[PDB]
Design a protein around this ligand. Sequence first.
Ligand SMILES: [Zn+2]
Ligand SMILES: [Zn+2]
Ligand SMILES: [Zn+2]
Ligand SMILES: [Zn+2]
Lengths: 386, 386
Amino acid sequence: HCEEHLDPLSIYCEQDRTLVCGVCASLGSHRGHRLLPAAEAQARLKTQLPQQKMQLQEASMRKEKTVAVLEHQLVEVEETVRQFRGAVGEQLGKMRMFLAALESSLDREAERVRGDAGVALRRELSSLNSYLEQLRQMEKVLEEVADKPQTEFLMKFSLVTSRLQKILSESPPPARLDIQLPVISDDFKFQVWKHMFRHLMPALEELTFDPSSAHPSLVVSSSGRRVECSDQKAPPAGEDTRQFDKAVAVVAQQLLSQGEHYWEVEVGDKPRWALGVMAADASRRGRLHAVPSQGLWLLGLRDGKILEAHVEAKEPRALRTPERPPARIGLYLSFADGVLAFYDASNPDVLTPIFSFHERLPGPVYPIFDVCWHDKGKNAQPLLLV
Amino acid sequence: HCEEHLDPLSIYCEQDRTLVCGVCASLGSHRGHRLLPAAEAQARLKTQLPQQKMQLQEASMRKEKTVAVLEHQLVEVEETVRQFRGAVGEQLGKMRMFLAALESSLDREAERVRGDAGVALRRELSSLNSYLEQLRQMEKVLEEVADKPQTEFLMKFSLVTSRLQKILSESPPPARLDIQLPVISDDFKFQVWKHMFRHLMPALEELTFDPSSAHPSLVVSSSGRRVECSDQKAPPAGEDTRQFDKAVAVVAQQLLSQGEHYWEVEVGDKPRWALGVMAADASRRGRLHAVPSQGLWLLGLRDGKILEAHVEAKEPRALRTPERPPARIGLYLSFADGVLAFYDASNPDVLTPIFSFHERLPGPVYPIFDVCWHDKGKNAQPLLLV
Ligand SMILES: [Zn+2]
Ligand SMILES: [Zn+2]
Ligand SMILES: [Zn+2]
Ligand SMILES: [Zn+2]
């Protein structure tokens, strides 16, 4: 039953795995092959069956493994798309909400201005309208009684004279102040955009200084909000990893480890200071090396107008100092983006950036504040936690 | 009818303007006054009447003029409130529109990603499911055939072996499918805010150069969008104040006189160039003085990386050159705020400021572009009007 050479099917090619006839084995598909008979070939395959069953089941198992992983991936793709869309909506609705609130506030402004102006104008209008009624009566009665008996004539004339005299010699309205309603012209959109940044910042990280960590020559007041140096000698710090010994500074009690945070520090006219974050595991001993590899991310100002960033280098990098020694610094921290950014927050409405590090933070960090050395009393400025 | 002394009323008090009887005029409230009789008093007042009526008319005229002025003031206050509300609505709807458009674009992108991922995953699932059906058929036939004729048994066993071999060597990826799905981060708000500025700008002032004013050593192409110098000589400039003759430059055909405008100029790697505005009354002849007092507001770049602002002084002011030579400059102009602002538009999506003039402009001005000289063919870069 060869169906190709018309012989019974008796020869089995091993290296071809096909049952054949004699002609294809003599001069055909199997001229130089390893041949076997059909009987012992069948007897071999009846024993080879379990291996084939095992291999079939294993192949099905692998393909099913891939099916399961891919369907789980389909569910994961759906869920990730949902999360992306929802978070985009949330973080754009934040700014849209800011816009709606500002427009509502401006509507309040305009309505209040209109109401007060209308109140004052209608007050004067009522006064003048009563006045006009008075005067119309004056003219009518004078004309109508300029023919009456002498007694009536003189009485009415005297009354008219008195009424006209007083209403002419009446005191004007007292002194009000206008509510001008300042008008917006072109830069209003730009200023709204500038103002939106402060609201883009997260809720203020309400921090307090940790006197349990401060230098012994420092003093903390205002319930953890004020740190300053002193013009007097102090006992040396007790043996502790949680206390500075040479560089006068202090960390906050709160440990930042997740999410995003923002805090402002008031520095005023301080000639030298330093601000930033510090790795919690870092060592607070000796004169410090200001490099991020040692757990120190610091922005400094020296000599009153020299603003320095303590970058990974041999000497801290200088920065383009603003037109003033900044009076308030703002610090933004994010782990999901690994950034600590510095801002000149002297303007409560606009923040201008100063510097920002770019390193996936090992975490966690303590807010660190370097109120600089005594300098013989020429650096008595404090640090104020806003 | 004195009703207080019960006498007829006959005496008129001059300094009091009141009719009285004889007793109160003799020794009473009007005892030492200048008195007159009722007859001559009436004869005087009947002739004084027209003057009093005239004075009444004058007072009425004053009060009615004031009433009219106050009603006009009320109406003007109403209209001013309307205008204020409308302008606030317009300039906030700009940003709301940007937000909505960005959110819709991101939603479209995310939906495209989800659809493509679903298509690919269902493709792989169909492939693997057809494979599993094949393998179930393999197992079925293997279980059913272990007694059949030599031809049937060996034929089907060889076919099963071949099919399993082929589907094993045509194996799809055993792993999961790459998706690179969009993630939402903390910096999304900051990036949207940075992007919002370019859309806060007005619609691009699509400008065309004015060949009627350019230097004869210049050439305008690309339908008014491209201006270049030439590496070959040209005829001397024709007699016109409205044509540059010595300083190679060109103004736009459009005249800016009111409102706000914004236009971008692509400069690429051009080493020296200048951009800005020029007063229409200014003279475009001879060697020019680059000072706003002579109607020229210009920012220039020389030596490829030296960015200077041609401010009102004896020497051009230096500027903070960026870490790159800017590839596109943006110019914003406003009259109601008197500002000409320059931006590094090398990124057309985010703008970093470069300089800004601050003068309520005398007006009006033509956008002027100083495409610098050939420099012996080493300054052949063009100026491209976006
Ligand atoms: Zn063979
Ligand atoms: Zn054959
Ligand atoms: Zn009397
Ligand atoms: Zn009297």
